[PDB]
Design a binder for this molecule. Structure first.
Ligand SMILES: CCCCCCCCCCCCCC(=O)OC[C@H](COP(=O)(O)OCC(O)COP(=O)(O)OC[C@@H](COC(=O)CCCCCCCCCCCCC)OC(=O)CCCCCCCCCCCCC)OC(=O)CCCCCCCCCCCCC
Ligand code: BCL
Ligand SMILES: CC[C@H]1c2cc3[nH]c4c(c3C)C(=O)[C@H](C(=O)OC)c4c3nc(cc4[nH]c(cc(n2)[C@@H]1C)c(C(C)=O)c4C)[C@@H](C)[C@@H]3CCC(=O)OC/C=C(\C)CCC[C@H](C)CCC[C@H](C)CCCC(C)C
Ligand SMILES: CC[C@H]1c2cc3[nH]c4c(c3C)C(=O)[C@H](C(=O)OC)c4c3nc(cc4[nH]c(cc(n2)[C@@H]1C)c(C(C)=O)c4C)[C@@H](C)[C@@H]3CCC(=O)OC/C=C(\C)CCC[C@H](C)CCC[C@H](C)CCCC(C)C
Ligand SMILES: *[C@H]1O[C@H](CO)[C@@H](O[C@@H]2O[C@@H](C)[C@H](O)[C@@H](O)[C@H]2O)[C@H](O)[C@@H]1O[C@H]1O[C@H](C(=O)O)[C@@H](O[C@H]2O[C@H](CO)[C@@H](O)[C@H](O)[C@H]2NC(C)=O)[C@H](OC(C)=O)[C@H]1OC(C)=O
Ligand SMILES: *[C@H]1O[C@H](CO)[C@@H](O[C@@H]2O[C@@H](C)[C@H](O)[C@@H](O)[C@H]2O)[C@H](O)[C@@H]1O[C@H]1O[C@H](C(=O)O)[C@@H](O[C@H]2O[C@H](CO)[C@@H](O)[C@H](O)[C@H]2NC(C)=O)[C@H](OC(C)=O)[C@H]1OC(C)=O
Ligand SMILES: CC(C)=CCC/C(C)=C/CC/C(C)=C/CC/C(C)=C/CC/C(C)=C/CC/C(C)=C/CC/C(C)=C/CC/C(C)=C/CC1=C(C)C(=O)c2ccccc2C1=O
Ligand SMILES: CCCCCC/C=C\CCCCCCCC(=O)O[C@H](COC(=O)CCCCCCCCCCCCCCC)COP(=O)(O)OCCN
Ligand SMILES: COC(C)(C)C/C=C/C(C)=C/C=C/C(C=O)=C/C=C/C(C)=C/C=C/C=C(C)/C=C/C=C(\C)CC/C=C(C)/C=C/C=C(\C)C(=O)O
Ligand SMILES: COC(C)(C)C/C=C/C(C)=C/C=C/C(C=O)=C/C=C/C(C)=C/C=C/C=C(C)/C=C/C=C(\C)CC/C=C(C)/C=C/C=C(\C)C(=O)O
Ligand SMILES: COC(C)(C)C/C=C/C(C)=C/C=C/C(C)=C/C=C/C(C)=C/C=C\C=C(C)\C=C\C=C(C)\C=C\C=C(C)\C=C\CC(C)(C)OC
Ligand SMILES: [Fe+3]
Lengths: 323, 71, 301, 273, 103, 39, 62, 60, 39, 60, 39
């Protein structure tokens, strides 16, 4: 699309030899190799473990449509590799009843951890702060609660199924089971930071593009040697809303809002079914729930008649009614 | 009435006109294909007296309602 | 104006408890009922002692009301005047063909009368004064909609037969030993509830305030009617439809050899009330299980 | 009070309306004509929210609930005690949000900046206007708006979702969620990269655009560049709100069934019907 | 209890024994809403707690032709309620399997 | 750019093009009318 | 045996105390440029007081 | 009265006018097509006395 | 940008084109009225 | 009429033309294959008086 | 660009190929009509 700076409209340029003293260097910033996409030992291992995880998921999905490759594509978003049955709790389940699930979950988790090691080592080698590995750690924290919350309630059956629509079925059913997740205050906070991340990157993206013709996009120079582009960015927000960040500190606001999305998220999941089993009733207790006029009223006879039963096991027989 | 072809470039007008007529033709065909009376692929062989006609009046019974009650 | 959406509010104004309908699609569905809806024979009842040789259910209505009922039954199940669907037409009292093979259709229809009386009589908390007649399920055809058979163990339609209990939500803040329901069990309830919503052509807010699905006070009164519908289907399926297994020909039976069973859609056919609330059963006292219908007393010979 | 470089920038000019009359500051804030109209709408709309709380059942902040009218009032103004007050507050909110964007355009003009910030904020205004004007208008009643209350609007979101049985299956909603999630990832990466070159381990020289370029290429396998990452953030953040507005406006006015059965077209493609 | 007394002379409402000029109405907040007191009061308006589950004492396996290949819990409502392709329907259950002895 | 002679000669083809199209469309309408009138 | 106090409420105020501490920290970082403010009746620091202006050590190449 | 075309470029106004008129025509056709009385694709062959009419004052 | 004589020439076509359209539209309304009057 | 090939570049025109006709052909075939009357892969061997026809008006 | 000579040469093929394709489509409609008329 068209753009409000000339910079790459036309007369883009080719470094025919490498940049770093299009093309790329083959050399080192200190001891860090600069040419290929970095892996190291942890990157290589992460790809092997993660490949087998994805391969187990795909093969179980494909087996579930009876190996039919037409149905494998046609039905793909409905397919899943599913957690164990509830009766097993934390015991090892049968291979076709969640044993492959826990195996793929294990290999995926190791693959994620090894990818964090990779990023951590690469940040050190490039002589950079560890901000990015700890940002990624906050995402891993939320992910890990999909293991620890099932552990704390005592059943692998509560884990998230691997599958496009099936994991969204789980997301809805989790909120249904625990009495409406909107009344989980850490879910509410996690949304506040999720929305705030879109607010900040909209504001910051627009701000830097609004001064890009004055070099505002060269943020490292503007941080170390403040130009008029940084000054105008500070003054716009000060005049708009009464206060402002700096060119450096807006990236701290950005960092924390993103990080706090998954951090508060993880706490809300860990609290669910361990401390609070019905968040709406917790909302009533602590005064979150707005009153509405009653839509129906039960007699005492209906209060006993309309009590249900908690859901049990499926029938394992096909009864004849011959009589 | 040629002076319009100096007022606007014929290439842009020619493309714009053909684009308009093609879009309009598709809209009218699909509006008809969606109708009951002119769903010609299924019913085009019906005689003019046999083709559907919209009601002079819909039917009712007082106890029946298409919508559930409320508010 | 036809791509327009009709909406019905069913809850408090700010709650978005609302039903949405495509206008065009709904008037199409409504017309497809309102035109085929069958005209009843006019009412009558003279005196006389019952001549019937093999009448086991309808032996409590006058001879004209009986004959009127048979005209209705043929119209509703088999097409009008098609007494041959159930009968050896030379010998209406017979329950077998000349070959001695049983008239299975007549044996079923006798049970369907008892079932219809049982529905109208014992499940008024569901069908109220609208009631049901043979037309509600059959709609002029031998096979109703929504027939179902044994398949998987976890098939949710068995909520309408031998299972009990769909609840998964805790009635308290803290976790307890009382409710150990799985998130998989919430997925099973969710699957079941989508089926009920589709069976009536409604959404969840017709029966719930979804801020708390467990709540009855915040839910519309329709949720209470829906619960009696579950209890009714269990009785219908366990006591009438499923035990008809030996009567049917094998072509009517499931892969497991089970008899066909009913579900919400069998009456409702995607509408919030069957036949959009058409009130036929008031015209056919043969099918009341009640001493009066909405104050109108039963003719009772 | 002023930043130690600020006074130099406080010139006249750049106003869209009102000339020099309102072209002045109040503390840190620039005023301008749309500053005046902002404070008018903010004050009126806030005080009517306080009145809505006063005539409601409680002062508890979480529980206050200013509901829209019943659907039976259609596009008319209801009695104020029956949702009409919600309508007046909605007109105040629209006036405030519009004034705020136009005031930002005056500020950007006065500093010689591009208009990017007003237009980005336009994406939020679009989503709001869709929720309370456009979708309720297409449905034919203002009562389809969401209530103004911190938790009572979450009850509205819940019930609107379940009006379509399984709102996760809404295709535009899946796109909007993907933008919101990818935006949060991109914000974490960009924030971390800038901070990690400007704040290296102790006793290490300050980093360079080359180091962040190299690290970013190791993360995504391509080099976005400094202008590109800000373009991407703006695209993701604003695109999220635009796709949000789409996903709600199609729900009801255009699609009325459950969202799962929308996917029937995919199952019926002729290659595999 | 539901309304104040009315003076028979003038049809005029008496509050605490003295007349009010005007037509008296009982004040209520918006739509008669009232703040929920506590969890116990909310629960006292609901049905009683659900009964304990009915759990099977032992598990009998179904025949293999009645076992689903797809373990996903909502699949019957989210897909099979609308998907009726013949080949895809057949794939939903495991095929018949028999020891070679018994053929 | 377009001259007045270019415009004049272009207009000839443009008018026969339009007229031929209207001739075909009107025959198409009268076939449709003979098959299934809309009034 | 506390009826009203529960673990989720305890956690939430733990977060609030952290969060307001974070906002204080972020506003100190926001003030490393352009502060102290200028006004009549002299310099102004706002609240919280800003952290000092920050010098950055360049890489050598000789 | 022709000096209006000094205030406004006729190359603009022609494109503006045709854009306006095309939109206005399409709006009116779709409004009529969505009505009951003038849904002329389905009911156009009804005589004027047979075409739908909206509800009157019922006195009931 | 139009001169006087250019504007005055264009105004002739613009008036007559407008009036010609309204005349055609008035016949369309006459036909529509005779088919199905709206008052 | 050949002067149109000075107005427009033949190489682009003819690529656009083939692309257009391919799309139109595929649209029409799949619209027919989706119908009942012309579901020719399933019902192509039926006689012309034996192939499906959409619903008529009633006799009224 | 292209000369008028080359334009006229191209036009000769273009018109021929168009009309040839329309002739084959005509036989295709002749065959389709013979098998299952749509009116
Ligand atoms: C939930 C997750 C997401 C939630 C997301 C939450 C994000 C929150 C972002 C907003 C926070 C920053 C706001 C800010 O710094 O504004 C500048 C202003 C003044 O300081 P200054 O700018 O450095 O100096 C200028 C001033 O000294 C001289 O200026 P001048 O003479 O020209 O003008 C007059 C003065 C008068 O002061 C005021 O009028 C402001 C008084 C009200 C400030 C309230 C701030 C919000 C607190 C939120 C935390 C909590 C409060 C309870 O200065 C001004 O005119 C400045 C006008 C600034 C207007 C800012 C309005 C922001 C409203 C934010 C509403 C947030 C709603 C969520 O600062 C302050 O007054 C102090 C604020 C310090 C941060 C709050 C930390 C609270 C920690 C916990 C309690 C601490 C107790 C000691
Ligand atoms: C009916 C549905 C329920 C509901 C149920 C849930 C549930 C259940 C959860 C959330 C959660 C979240 N919800 Mg909620 N949610 C609802 C309504 C909403 C609404 C709304 C407008 O209505 C919004 C905006 C949100 C928003 C949010 C987010 C704030 C939060 C997720 C944060 C995050 O970044 O996650 C996205 C980020 C991640 C998942 C981190 C992933 C990181 C890992 C490391 C990535 C690994 C990738 C790997 C290498 C490769 C994979 C390969 C494949 C396996 C093949 N919800 C309603 C009430 N919501 C979560 C939460 O935190 O709750 C407190 C959560 O668990
Ligand atoms: C702060 C919170 C947000 C966040 C942050 C975040 N995520 C991150 C990071 C950060 C800061 C990273 O640095 C990290 C990253 O790498 O980013 C590019 C990551 C990451 N976030 C990811 C995803 C992700 N983040 C999400 C969300 C979020 N991330 C939050 C919104 C989501 C959501 C919303 O669901 C997802 C899906 C990944 C893209 C990435 C971590 C990648 C990773 O761990 O990969 C592990 C490896 C595999 C799965 C294996 C792949 C296998 C190949 C396909 C096989 C090819 C063959 C192979 C070569 C064979 C082997 C041969 C050997 C000899 C090599
Ligand atoms: C592009 C899409 C994203 C976006 C971007 C964005 N938001 C922005 C901007 C940008 C680019 C600004 O420049 C602008 C700004 O100045 O930020 C500091 C703004 C802004 N985004 C804001 C909030 C906000 N943005 C949100 C979302 C989004 N913002 C999107 C995700 C949300 C969500 C999802 O909930 C919120 C709450 C403000 C902080 C600010 C706009 C400030 C403004 O308009 O001020 C004038 C008005 C007032 C101060 C008060 C008005 C009071 C009313 C008259 C009465 C109340 C009516 C209201 C409807 C009641 C609702 C009650 C709730 C409980 C429902
Ligand atoms: C087949 O058997 C299963 C397993 O019992 C039945 O499923 C039970 O009921 C469901 C509500 C629930 O979902 C499930 O967890 C399980 O509890 C299924 O309905 C079929 O039932 C018939 O067979 C039962 C059986 O187990 O054999 C039988 O049960 C009774 O008889 C057996 C044998 O004597 C005895 O072990 C059971 O304790 C006994 N149970 C009861 C409640 O009487 C059922 O008979 C009855 C009356 O329930 C069978 O049901 C029918 C209608 O035939
Ligand atoms: C079908 O079969 C039943 C058998 O019960 C017949 O029912 C009889 O007649 C009823 C009026 C009565 O209520 C009932 O108790 C019973 O007496 C029914 O009428 C139909 O009859 C035909 O088929 C009979 C059958 O069973 O095959 C046949 O019966 C006769 O022949 C069988 C042997 O083939 C013998 O077992 C029966 O005892 C015998 N019955 C008599 C009365 O002769 C009927 O034939 C005759 C003559 O009745 C069949 O009826 C006709 C008219 O074809
Ligand atoms: C109503 C009333 C009391 C009126 C009294 C009279 C008055 C005051 C009149 C004056 C005139 C006017 C119009 C006053 C406005 C008064 C109002 C309504 C004020 C409210 C202001 C307001 C919207 C506050 C909300 C603050 C919040 C929560 C914002 C959310 C986003 C957020 C967390 C921002 C923090 C991070 C910051 C500071 C971002 C801005 C920022 C960004 C985005 C950069 O990219 C950037 C790049 C380089 C350098 C600096 C920056 C920078 O500062
Ligand atoms: C970047 C990092 C920022 C971190 C900021 C802090 C934010 C969140 C941490 C939240 C921890 C919450 C613990 C929740 C469990 C809990 O409260 O369970 C309590 C026991 O009490 C307790 O555990 C008491 C908990 C006290 C919390 C003290 C401070 C936080 C410690 C954790 C620090 C994490 C660092 C990362 C049981 O509750 P109940 O309802 O069963 O009791 C009544 C039964 N009838
Ligand atoms: C129920 O449905 C809803 C939708 C609701 C109902 C309502 C519908 C509505 C509102 C409809 C409105 C319709 C409308 C309104 O204006 C319709 C107007 C239509 C028009 C204007 C049609 C005009 C067609 C003209 C054509 C095709 C011209 C072709 C020209 C050709 C082929 C020659 C090309 C040049 C050549 C060969 C050489 C040039 C010389 C050169 C190069 C040289 O010499 O150099
Ligand atoms: C029910 O379904 C719905 C959809 C609803 C119903 C409605 C449908 C609708 C609205 C349909 C509209 C149809 C339409 C509208 O425009 C259809 C228009 C079709 C047209 C114009 C087709 C034209 C085809 C022309 C062709 C193929 C030309 C081929 C030329 C060839 C082969 C020779 C090329 C030159 C050569 C080789 C030599 C080069 C010179 C050289 C090298 C040299 O000189 O050196
Ligand atoms: C031939 O190759 C083929 C064609 C098969 C390759 C193609 C493969 C395809 C098409 C794959 C498709 C994959 C898709 C679509 C995947 C979708 C995945 C989604 C959407 C997943 C969403 C969420 C999943 C979550 C949150 C899972 C979390 C699991 C966790 C945290 C599990 C942890 C397990 C641990 C830590 C340990 C387990 C081992 C035990 C319990 C024993 O402890 C030691
Ligand atoms: Fe930046």
């Amino acid at each position: 699309m068209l753009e409000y700076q000339n910079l790459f409209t036309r007369v883009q340029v080719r470094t025919v030899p490498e940049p770093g003293i299009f093309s790329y260097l083959a050399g080192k910033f200190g001891d860090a190799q600069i040419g290929p996409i970095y892996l190291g030992w942890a990157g290589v291992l992460s790809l092997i473990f993660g490949f087998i995880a994805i391969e187990i998921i795909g093969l179980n999905m494909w087996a579930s449509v009876g190996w039919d490759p037409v149905e494998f594509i046609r039905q793909l978003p409905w397919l899943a590799l599913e957690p164990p049955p509830p009766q097993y709790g934390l015991r090892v389940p049968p291979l076709n009843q969640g044993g492959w699930y826990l195996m793929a979950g294990f290999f995926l988790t190791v693959s994620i951890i090894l990818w964090w090691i990779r990023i951590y080592r690469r940040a050190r080698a490039l002589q950079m702060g560890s901000h990015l590995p700890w940002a990624f750690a906050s995402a891993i924290f939320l992910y890990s609660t999909f293991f620890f919350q099932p552990l704390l309630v005592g059943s692998w059956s509560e884990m998230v199924p691997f599958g496009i629509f099936p994991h969204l079925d789980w997301t809805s059913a989790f909120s249904i089971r625990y009495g409406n997740l909107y009344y989980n205050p850490f879910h509410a906070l996690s949304i506040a930071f999720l929305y705030g991340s879109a607010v900040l990157f909209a504001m910051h993206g627009a701000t830097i593009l609004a001064v890009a013709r004055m070099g505002g996009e060269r943020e490292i120079e503007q941080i170390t040697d403040r130009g008029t582009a940084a000054e105008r960015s500070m003054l716009f927000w000060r005049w708009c809303m009464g206060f402002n960040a700096t060119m450096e500190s807006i990236h701290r606001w950005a960092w924390w809002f993103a990080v706090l999305t998954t951090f508060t998220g993880g706490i809300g999941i860990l609290l669910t079914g361990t401390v609070v089993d019905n968040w709406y009733l917790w909302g009533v207790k602590h005064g979150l729930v707005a009153p509405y006029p009653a839509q129906n009223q039960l007699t005492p006879e209906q209060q006993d008649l309309l009590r249900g039963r908690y859901q049990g096991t499926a029938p394992d027989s096909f009864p004849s009614y011959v009589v | 009435m040629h002076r319009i072809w100096l007022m606007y470039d014929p290439r842009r007008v020619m493309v714009a006109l053909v684009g308009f007529l093609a879009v309009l033709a598709l809209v009218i065909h699909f509006v008809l294909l969606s109708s009951q009376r002119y769903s010609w692929i299924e019913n085009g062989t019906l005689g003019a007296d046999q083709a559907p006609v919209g009601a002079s009046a819909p039917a009712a019974a007082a106890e029946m309602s298409p919508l559930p009650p409320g508010r | 104006g036809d791509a327009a959406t009709d909406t019905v509010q069913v809850g408090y104004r700010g709650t978005a408890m609302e039903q949405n309908y495509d206008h065009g699609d709904l008037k199409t569905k409504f017309a497809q009922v309102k035109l085929p809806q069958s005209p009843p024979p006019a009412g009558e009842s003279p005196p006389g002692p019952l001549p019937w040789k093999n009448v086991q259910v309808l032996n409590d209505i006058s001879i004209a009301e009986f004959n009127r009922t048979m005209i209705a039954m043929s119209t509703w199940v088999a097409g009008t005047g098609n007494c041959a669907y159930c009968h050896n037409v030379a010998a209406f009292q017979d329950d077998t063909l000349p070959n001695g093979k049983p008239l299975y259709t007549k044996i079923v229809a006798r049970r369907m009368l008892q079932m219809t009386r049982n529905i109208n009589g014992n499940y008024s908390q569901h069908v109220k004064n609208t009631g049901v007649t043979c037309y509600t399920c059959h709609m002029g055809k031998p096979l109703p909609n929504g027939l179902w058979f044994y398949s998987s163990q976890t098939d949710y339609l068995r909520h309408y037969l031998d299972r009990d209990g769909a609840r998964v939500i805790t009635q308290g803040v803290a976790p307890s030993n009382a409710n150990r329901s799985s998130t998989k069990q919430a997925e099973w309830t969710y699957a079941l509830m989508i089926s009920q919503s589709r069976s009536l052509g409604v959404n969840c807010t017709y029966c719930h305030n979804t801020r708390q699905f467990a709540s009855w006070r915040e839910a519309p009164p329709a949720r209470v009617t829906a619960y009696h519908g579950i209890l009714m289907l269990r009785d219908v399926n366990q006591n009438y439809l499923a035990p008809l297994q030996p009567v049917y020909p094998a072509v009517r039976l499931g892969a497991m050899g089970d008899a066909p069973k009913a579900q919400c859609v069998t009456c409702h056919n995607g509408a919030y009330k069957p036949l959009y609330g058409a009130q036929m059963a008031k015209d056919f006292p043969a099918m009341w299980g009640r001493a009066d219908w909405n104050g109108v007393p039963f003719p009772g010979i | 009070a002023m930043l130690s470089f600020e006074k130099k920038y406080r010139v006249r000019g750049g106003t869209l309306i009102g000339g020099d009359l309102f072209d002045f500051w109040f503390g840190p804030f620039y005023v301008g004509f749309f500053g005046v109209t902002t404070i008018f709408f903010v004050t009126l709309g806030t005080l009517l929210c306080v009145w809505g709380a006063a005539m409601g059942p409680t002062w508890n902040l979480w529980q206050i609930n200013i509901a829209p009218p019943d659907l039976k009032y259609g596009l008319g103004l209801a009695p104020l005690r029956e949702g009409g007050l919600w309508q007046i507050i909605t007109l105040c909110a629209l006036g405030a949000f519009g004034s705020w964007a136009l005031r930002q355009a005056e500020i950007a003009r006065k500093l010689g900046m591009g208009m990017h910030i007003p237009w980005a904020y336009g994406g939020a205004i679009l989503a709001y206007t869709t929720l309370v004007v456009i979708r309720p208008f297409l449905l034919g009643a203002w009562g389809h708006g969401f209530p103004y209350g911190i938790f009572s609007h979450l009850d509205w979101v819940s019930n609107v979702g379940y009006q379509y049985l399984h709102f996760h299956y809404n295709p535009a909603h899946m796109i909007a969620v993907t933008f919101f999630f990818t935006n949060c990832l991109a914000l974490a990466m960009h924030g971390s990269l800038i901070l990690s070159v400007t704040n290296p381990p102790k006793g290490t020289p300050t980093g360079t655009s080359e180091q962040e370029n190299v690290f970013f290429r190791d993360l995504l396998g391509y080099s976005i560049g400094a202008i590109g990452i800000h373009r991407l953030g703006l695209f993701l953040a604003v695109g999220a709100a635009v796709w949000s507005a789409i996903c709600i406006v199609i729900s009801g006015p255009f699609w009325t069934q459950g969202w799962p059965e929308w996917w029937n077209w995919w199952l019926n493609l002729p290659i595999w019907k | 209890p539901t309304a104040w007394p009315v003076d028979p002379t003038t049809g005029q409402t008496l509050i605490n024994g003295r007349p009010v000029v005007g037509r008296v109405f009982i004040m209520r907040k918006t739509d008669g809403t009232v703040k929920y007191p506590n969890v116990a009061d909310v629960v006292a308006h609901e049905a009683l707690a659900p009964l304990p589950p009915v759990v099977g004492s032992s598990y009998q396996q179904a025949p293999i032709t009645n076992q689903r290949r797809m373990r996903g819990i909502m699949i019957q409502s989210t897909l099979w309620d609308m998907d009726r392709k013949r080949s895809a329907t057949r794939q939903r259950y495991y095929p018949a399997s028999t020891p070679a002895n018994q053929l | 750019g377009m001259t007045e002679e270019e415009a004049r000669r272009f207009h000839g083809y443009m008018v026969t093009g339009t007229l031929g199209y209207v001739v075909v469309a009107s025959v198409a309408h009268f076939l449709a009318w003979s098959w299934r009138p809309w009034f | 045996m506390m009826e009203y106090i529960d673990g989720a409420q305890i956690a939430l105020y733990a977060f609030w105390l952290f969060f307001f501490g974070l906002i204080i920290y972020l506003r100190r970082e926001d003030k490393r440029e352009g502060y102290p403010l200028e006004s009549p009746q002299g310099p102004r620091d706002g609240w919280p007081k800003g952290a000092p202006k920050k010098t950055y050590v360049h890489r050598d190449h000789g």
